[PDB]
Design a protein around this ligand. Structure first.
Ligand code: HEM
Ligand SMILES: [Mn+2]
Length: 462
């Protein structure tokens, strides 16, 4: 298996083909999960846990079967089957007495990452995230029905010594254009690393294109040999970040309002204040390409910041620019910068009674108990999720503006002390203004953990 480039899944042979037969879904290509049940488990007895996992492997489809289902849906509107994802924590490997993946963030666990990420202390996390977690189960589908069915089958197999220490439910949100959004109202999950050549072709043929931004990512950017598997040369897994992030929509919308007022913004153009925080409008037109919304036919991703090196269109500290400078970061060569990028597979949680894109005042938005079940696959947690959160988002110095100044923290997910930032009131011009206050932190980490999704052959071998 060649991990140095993308893979053409349809014409893969030999080991690469085997790898696909033994890989879980949702990794090389996201699985539909508009209804998602998340189950965190505790292992009371090692032998019983191994038996449980073995039975789970029986309910699991491979990456390749999933891909076929995807192709079938496009071709013939076929529905496909549910997603059963299985991850193990370092502690869960210890309970099983099995050789574990060696990523040091994985080994230490998310509770140990609290200091370097500037996370709230573990004592401030929700109760179930304070407990020792051995495993996560992901049950996902387009609709609630088959999730209920799958849950019953999982239950059937579950022994009493495998406890459920916690559960979450994901509910996908969409706008009128049919694009998925997060609670602040913005199209989310547009920009993804593409590991499959067929996905890169699709992106080229059916979106704005891939002329300016190449979304390709080598297999090594997500896949890891499964160390305890019968044959790590063909049996692969991936590291998995789960973090429950609460969104105070109310405060975020007040923040949009106050920044607009601060910058003298007027009329509908007041919406651009929000775009400055995120890097896209709600719809989400890239702020680096347009001063206003409307480019969602379809939502584009074919852009870089090479004509925006001064940040006068999209500010340096906008969320997507902080988290993917697209070669403009200034700290390392573009070819190395992009190695920190990762596959995001999150799902929103919570129910609300307001259309997230409706024209409503901030007071009518929820302030808690909705948000994002942030999820991602990494081949190297320290160099991908943690790098992005710590070295980019939380870092006041990054990315490097040509004038050598510090743009400050990512306003959407930045953690730690914040200060007022600078913005360009006039799109594409050199006028600069310093807000009267820092953007308030409207996202709160409620608890999370690190896992590894092992190969199917490993799970069967237990
Ligand atoms: C509640 C928390 C979060 C919210 C509301 C949020 C929102 C968004 C939105 C609206 C976009 C633009 C749509 C897209 O390109 O997919 C985006 C993109 C992105 N986000 Fe976040 N996000 C959150 C958490 C995170 C975290 C924790 C990370 C990493 C530590 C992250 C990394 C990224 C990356 C890498 C992109 C794509 C950037 C690009 O390639 O242009 N996000 N996010
Ligand atoms: Mn807005």
């Amino acid at each position: 298996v060649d991990l140095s480039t993308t893979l053409s899944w349809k014409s893969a042979t030999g080991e690469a083909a085997t790898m696909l037969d033994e890989l879980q879904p949702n990794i090389l290509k996201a699985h539909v999960r508009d209804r998602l049940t998340v189950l965190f488990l505790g292992f009371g007895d090692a032998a019983e846990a191994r038996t449980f996992l073995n039975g789970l492997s029986g309910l699991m489809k491979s990456a390749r079967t999933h891909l076929q289902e995807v192709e079938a849906h496009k071709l013939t509107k076929a529905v496909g089957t549910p997603y059963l994802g299985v991850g193990l924590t370092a502690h869960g490997y210890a309970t099983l007495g099995v050789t574990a993946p060696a990523d040091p963030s994985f080994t230490a666990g998310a509770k140990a990452a609290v200091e370097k990420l500037a996370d709230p202390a573990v004592t401030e996390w929700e109760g179930h995230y304070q407990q020792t977690i051995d495993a996560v189960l992901l049950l996902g589908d387009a609709t609630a029905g088959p999730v209920r069915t799958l849950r019953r089958q999982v239950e059937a197999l579950r022994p009493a010594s495998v406890t459920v220490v916690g559960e979450e439910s994901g509910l996908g949100l969409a706008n009128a254009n049919g694009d998925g959004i997060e609670h602040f109202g913005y199209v989310d999950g547009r920009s993804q690393p593409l590991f499959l050549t067929e996905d890169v072709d699709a992106e080229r043929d059916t979106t704005d294109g891939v002329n300016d931004w190449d979304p390709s990512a080598p297999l090594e950017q997500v896949l890891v040999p499964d160390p305890a598997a019968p044959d790590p040369t063909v049996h692969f897994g991936s590291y998995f970040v789960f973090r429950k992030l609460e969104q105070n929509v109310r405060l975020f919308k007040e923040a949009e309002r106050d920044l607009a007022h601060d910058l003298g913004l007027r009329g509908e153009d007041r919406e651009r204040a929000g775009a400055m925080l995120v890097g896209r409008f709600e719809d989400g037109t890239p702020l680096t390409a347009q001063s206003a919304p409307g480019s969602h036919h379809p939502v584009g991703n074919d852009f870089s910041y090479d004509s925006d090196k001064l940040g006068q269109k999209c500010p340096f500290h906008a969320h997507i620019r902080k988290t993917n400078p697209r070669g403009s970061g200034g700290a390392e060569a573009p070819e190395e910068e992009r190695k920190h990028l990762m596959a995001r597979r999150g799902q929103t949680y919570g129910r609300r009674h307001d259309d997230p894109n409706a024209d409503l005042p901030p007071r009518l938005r929820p302030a808690k108990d909705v948000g994002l079940l942030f999820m991602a696959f990494n081949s190297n947690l320290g160099n991908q999720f943690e790098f992005t959160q710590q070295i980019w988002a939380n870092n006041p110095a990054f990315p490097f503006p040509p004038d050598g100044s510090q743009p400050g923290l990512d306003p959407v997910i930045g953690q730690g002390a914040r200060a007022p930032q600078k913005y360009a009131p006039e799109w594409g011009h050199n006028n600069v203004a310093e807000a009267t206050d820092p953007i308030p932190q409207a996202v709160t980490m409620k608890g999370g953990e690190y896992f590894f999704m092992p190969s199917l052959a490993f799970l069967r071998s237990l």
